[PDB]
Amino acid sequence: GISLIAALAVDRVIGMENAMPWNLPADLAWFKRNTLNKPVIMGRHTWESIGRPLPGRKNIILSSQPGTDDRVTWVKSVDEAIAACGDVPEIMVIGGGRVYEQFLPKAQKLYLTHIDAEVEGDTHFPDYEPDDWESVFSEFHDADAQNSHSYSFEILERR
């Protein structure tokens, strides 16, 4: 199916103009664990924030304009993005806000990191009602020497 994976500060903030004011290697490890060797769909701005392909995966970039890096696959519509993933057990949608908004109604699972941080942002994860979803996994973690804020992971499966 289609899954979304995202890291959310309070008020569902996911993005801003500058780099996020946190350091969460545990969230990166979680992202890798759940996307390894799966196709990833991302918007063009998320692509520019990474700068290079995520290894071992089909990288699919949504843009209305021709692609500018032949190392990844560029598509001009949601339907083309899904088609480019082919026949796979799980498609991972990795951001950003505009892309999450379009794929949420298609998604069966959400992988969410909730960060105990209040940050001014210009992009939010789309609204969802927790009652429409079942929490199948949850774990809370404190900040530590490597992670600047406390955070929790949850996996929600659409009811």
Ligand SMILES: [Ca+2]
């Ligand atoms: Ca940004």
Ligand code: NA
């Ligand atoms: Na899994």
